[PDB]
Curated annotation (Swiss-Prot), chain A:
Keywords for this protein: FAD, Flavoprotein, NAD, NADP, Oxidoreductase, Redox-active center
Name by which UniProt lists this protein: NAD(P)H coenzyme A polysulfide/persulfide reductase
Subunit structure comment from the entry: Homodimer. Homotetramer.
EC category name: oxidoreductase
Domain of life the protein comes from: Archaea
Protein role: Catalyzes the NAD(P)H-dependent reduction of polysulfide, CoA-polysulfides, and CoA persulfide, as well as the reduction of a range of other small persulfides, including TNB and glutathione persulfides. The likely in vivo substrates are di-, poly-, and persulfide derivatives of coenzyme A, although polysulfide itself is also efficiently reduced. Shows coenzyme A disulfide reductase (CoADR) activity with both NADH and NADPH, with a preference for NADPH. May also play a role in the reduction of elemental sulfur.
Length: 442, 443
């Protein structure tokens, strides 16, 4: 029998789920309901759209007709799913009902709303979806901005901060405690991003935002600490998964806050799946259920969800917590457990923090790179690697493979990594790190 | 007790071994005999010093003072090992000869360029690019004599790296390649073709030519091949290299089928207490398990490390090599790991391949260059046999793939590996992941 598949949300995870199902089952009716004008879009591009490095149409991978005419997917744009119950969906010109044999929550995560005064003032913005990027640029046109404040010291906030310093503004970051990205990175890595950050940005640590002032336009921001002139505000205080439709069916919600899924991306409710930013996943090292709202996993989850619906078993092994960002000259990145995390999990750990060069001592253009590694004292296995400086991608990606596989410090050392003078030093920083840790054996 | 450890060769392999031994056994007598004046040197920097992009003193990692004073190695510079016998080594240093007892011996005397049977190889103006003294000799010749036209006899990596060194200096460069294509021995056609496009535009690329003779006055002026003549004031012979095994043979040391000194995981040779590390040594291949010869720097260094540890009674095993290597001509990056399609087929594998094109950034973020990937896969097990990468930003794809191959990843293992994404780094689907997907998990 043909079967009716319904997908809520037309982002990365949603279309990956949509494509996969139709690809495997062309005779099946695959509907996607997206609330906005946007499909196959990238929230990752926003900062760079706003910076103006590029345009907002380039936050699409594929246009609608590629999905409808070229891939046979019944794509409903401007369509908001408002209710769900067993076997039925309710959507909004018009408010119609649809039946499903399978359901995918490819539903994403909306930004967290801190309840303080002036949050609703023309002038205050939160960066999540592509319509937000156009709204900020449509604003900087209708008004004249020179002072910008950013509440949040995470990555979303840093990328937005950079997106304004490049446009030559007086930017102020207000983070709620002792360091930037304290939740995800360790101090000795975070310090090196901050040296560069302090300089190009008014970094205000250990502060809480109290109110936002203005008329109908924003004009000032007050914190427990001091006042700052501001004509535009970005709020990046974290995000939370859109779980409100999920509960509508008493789908299990994870310790994490996101929708509980298994290896097949199935939920606690039969024929109901979940993928992307709404979905809680598994950690590859730890085995703990964890929430890591990032793009590559989002897509893979959609791919995995699509496959199981179309009746070919596939497992998603989980995630490593691999992530990477940048402030100007400085590349920041991790994969696996941070020292803090590894401690929280009750591991017995040793660590190492080294500096190296990015090129051999002869070939020019050699820049600095720092690496912190975390190792389990009992097994010698790597638990995580953090890298900062220049040219950190080969290291992070490489270490991610090694972790996936459960490499030891010794396994890493003898791995045949490449060397040429225009590429890396003789002793690759990753294998240097792995040597400084040592291979202990009772 | 307090053993005597003698190491022939002061390159990466020798110094790694000497350092390791002394580090584990500080009460031991450790001697390094190096023929030249250079210790801890980088022959890998010869092309870049020739280009003038770097000074020669930059080829040394540590000054010899560090090994002697700071580490305790009895380093003997300008000292050549002439004969080897069980227990003894004959060395020529201060014009004369002398004798040294060894309890442990390491061959780290590397590999030297193959001397071709052409007439006129010994004219002045003809150089080999193998050791640091060569790089000086090349600059000093360009200083003493006017050079406009440069001819490279090559095809392989050194050749291309030497060819580039002369081009960006404005010189007129010609490459003589025996048979169909550049780098034909180590890469597949569809990979080298992309480099070759870039080569021909900045090089007089001459394929399927056997250089017959090098002619000139007292010094070089022309190169004659069975294809024709080429005006040349300077010649680089880079037709391949051979392991220095002639003094191993005196000891009765087993030589592997590759031509290099046979070893095991411990870097031990056929002869008791005798070791070999670096470009002299034959090692294991991580995938095939076959004996292989890959004269490259990171392996040579680890081989020295491993040899040192075993001499000093701390057992360690070198797992072998993947055939991982990387080069660049201009802004074209070329690199491989594992087996090519040709190697795999030669080894009798049931093989499927894929060749894809992608970008280094997403279509929003700018600066996106082109990247091409080739993957070889075993049909029966779904495991990656090898990956070749060409274009821009290829280091992540090779290093990551190397780890995967080292470990025995399948295409599905590769596909589901948590690789990093941010716009200034890569596209949402890393080109490696696309390769793994286009390859397929057929079972
Ligand atoms: C500014 C920013 C920068 C980022 N940078 C990176 C990065 O560098 N690297 C990285 O890996 N990740 C990054 N991410 C995260 C990445 O964008 C997400 O993890 C990924 O896009 C998740 O895809 P998704 O389809 O699951 O959710 P989304 O991409 O958010 O798609 C969900 C869609 O569902 C729609 N929807 C919501 N509710 C309904 C409803 N009730 N009815 C119908 N439709 C609905 C929404 O309109 C939305 O379009 C970034 C995110 C942001 C916000
Ligand atoms: C032009 C060029 C470019 C290269 N580029 C790269 C690259 O990009 N990446 C890479 O991984 N590898 C590269 N290599 C290879 C790399 O240099 C070698 O694999 C590495 O140096 C091997 O170290 P080794 O000590 O075994 O040999 P060597 O570094 O050559 O050391 C051997 C030493 O032993 C000495 N010796 C020889 N005979 C005697 C004797 N009779 N008595 C005493 N001493 C003796 C020699 O003088 C020599 O200094 C390149 C090589 C060349 C020539
Ligand atoms: C593109 C998207 C819809 C997924 O669709 P997908 O079909 O799984 O991925 P592709 O369109 O690239 O793949 C189509 C086919 O081409 C092949 N392919 C992809 N790239 C290729 C390449 N460069 N060379 C050769 N083949 C390629 C794939 O193998 C696939 O084959 P298959 O259908 O048999 O599996 C989804 O990832 C998306 O919405 N992306 C944009 C949004 C986003 O990811 N943003 C990032 C979050 S901020
Ligand atoms: C340098 C050489 C002698 C090896 O020496 P080594 O002692 O084994 O390696 P290092 O010099 O880095 O040793 C430094 C020590 O400090 C440690 N260290 C700590 N932090 C470090 C850092 N951030 N970077 C490098 N080493 C660090 C190393 O782990 C090592 O520890 P160990 O003594 O306990 O083993 C050898 O590689 C050589 O001669 N190289 C020159 C030629 C070459 O590199 N290649 C030739 C062709 S390109």
């Amino acid at each position: 029998m043909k079967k009716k598949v319904v997908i809520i949300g037309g982002g990365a995870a949603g279309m990956s789920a949509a494509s996969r199902v139709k690809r495997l089952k062309p005779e099946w009716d695959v509907k996607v309901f997206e609330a906005t004008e946007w499909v196959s879009h990238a929230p990752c591009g926003i900062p760079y759209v706003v910076e103006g490095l590029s345009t907002p149409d380039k936050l699409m991978y594929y246009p609608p007709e590629v999905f409808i005419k070229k891939r046979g997917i019944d794509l409903h744009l401007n369509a908001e799913v408002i209710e769900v119950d067993t076997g039925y969906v309710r959507v909004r010109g018009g408010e119609k009902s649809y039946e499903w044999d399978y359901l995918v929550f490819a539903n994403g995560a909306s930004p967290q709303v801190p309840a303080i005064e002036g949050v609703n003032l023309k002038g205050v913005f939160t960066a999540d979806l592509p319509p937000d990027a156009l709204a900020i640029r449509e604003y900087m046109e209708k008004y004249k901005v020179e002072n910008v404040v950013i509440i949040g010291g995470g990555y979303i906030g840093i990328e937005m901060a950079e997106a304004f310093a490049a446009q030559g503004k007086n930017v102020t970051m207000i983070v709620r405690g002792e360091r930037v990205l304290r939740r995800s990175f360790d101090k000795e890595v975070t310090d090196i991003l901050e040296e560069k950050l302090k300089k190009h940005v008014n970094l205000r640590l250990q502060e809480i935002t109290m109110k936002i002032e203005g008329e109908e336009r924003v004009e000032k921001v007050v914190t427990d600490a001091g006042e700052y002139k501001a004509e535009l505000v970005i709020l990046a205080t974290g995000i939370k998964p859109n779980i409100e439709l999920a509960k509508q069916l008493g789908v299990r919600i994870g310790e994490t806050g996101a929708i509980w899924t298994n290896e097949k991306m199935q939920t606690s409710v039969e024929n109901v799946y979940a993928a992307g930013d709404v979905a809680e996943t598994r950690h590859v090292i730890t085995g703990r259920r964890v929430w890591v709202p990032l793009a590559p996993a989002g897509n893979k989850m959609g791919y995995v969800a699509g496959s199981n619906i179309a009746g070919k078993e596939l497992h998603f092994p989980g995630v490593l917590g691999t992530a990477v960002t940048k402030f100007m000259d400085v590349e920041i990145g991790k994969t696996g457990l941070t020292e803090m995390e590894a401690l929280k999990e009750g591991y017995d750990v040793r660590t190492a923090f080294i500096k190296a060069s990015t090129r051999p001592h002869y070939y020019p253009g050699g820049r600095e790179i720092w690496l912190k590694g975390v190792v389990d004292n009992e097994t010698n296995r790597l638990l995580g690697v953090q890298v900062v400086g220049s040219d950190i991608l080969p290291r992070i990606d490489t270490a991610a493979a090694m972790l996936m596989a459960g490499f030891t410090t010794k396994d890493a050392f003898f791995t045949d990594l490449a060397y040429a003078p225009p590429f890396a030093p003789v002793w690759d920083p990753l294998i240097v790190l792995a040597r400084v840790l040592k291979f202990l054996e009772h």
